[PDB]
């Protein structure tokens, strides 16, 4: 039974023999390397007294993926100061009041706040919503907008479900199949965006009129991951059609950066809502696939396992997510090896560090029993 029921979170590092003191130190150090004055590793930058952002170092932009991640990280770490700086920047610079995506958040901005696009990215929205619910539950709603956290979360999720009913907009979930979309104006998906464990919580906390819908989305997503992951290797493509097969129209049909999050998501869902045979077997498959592969040699792979020449752009992120996946298969043949590999991998430096380092801190939090559900 998951932590949602027991309110106890597995410390897999401790279970695998790491000392409580060293785990405590490693979690804090990871946070400090990302959010402190450590220029080589840092991904969070403060602006003035009331703003801050996470920089996508690989593209020199600020993304809703990173901002929503940063808010989730901040609430897990009980850092309301950092949470509010990020959310303030997000509302000021990313929230759209105009155009077909009004009510969503521009997916990419320049560090100066300028929007690079008026299109949103659904995985940002869903993390914003849950981070905001957690903020409300830990700290209470603030007296002034936009710090009225729970109202902001419910409003945002309303738009995600109902957009287009009285306007030219589009929802972020397909209403018939209850699957999250890659972007509001398409009818395909992205396996890594599927967060059934988040939807379970939305089914408790969203507007009441949408709570059954969120239960249905959770179930739809669980079923969808079964058909999206390759049956032998466990690898999921970056984009996939609703029928579960890869969408490679623009090169996203393979196992690469986006896909890495699937193992992590499966890990977290197992920890929160309970183990399943499917999830354990799926994590066993991915870990078995990587068991005989050197991190320095990790590639892009077709989902059936065929290697490309191209190396993984984010191999530290791949390590972190595979290790986090161990939460879904704690007795798995490679579970300990994956956790140990991660323990022995430093936080990344250099221009591609943002994505790896986000996945890294999530894995550090989850594997130490510090990626929690914050209840009212
Ligand atoms: Ni120490």
UniProtKB/Swiss-Prot annotation:
Protein name: Reducing end xylose-releasing exo-oligoxylanase
Organism encoding this protein: Halalkalibacterium halodurans (strain ATCC BAA-125 / DSM 18197 / FERM 7344 / JCM 9153 / C-125) (Bacillus halodurans)
InterPro entries named in the record: 6-hairpin_glycosidase_sf, 6hp_glycosidase-like_sf, Glyco_hydro_8
Active site per database record: 65, 258
Record-linked Pfam families: Glyco_hydro_8 (PF01270)
Signal peptide: none
Upper lineage: Bacteria, Bacillati, Bacillota, Bacilli, Bacillales
Enzyme class: hydrolase
Sequence similarity: Belongs to the glycosyl hydrolase 8 (cellulase D) family.
Annotated thermal dependence: Optimum temperature is 50 degrees Celsius. Stable up to 40 degrees Celsius.
Reactions listed under catalytic activity: Hydrolysis of (1->4)-beta-D-xylose residues from the reducing end of oligosaccharides
Keywords tagged on the record: Carbohydrate metabolism, Glycosidase, Hydrolase, Polysaccharide degradation, Xylan degradation
Lineage top rank: taxon: Bacteria
GO biological process: xylan catabolic process
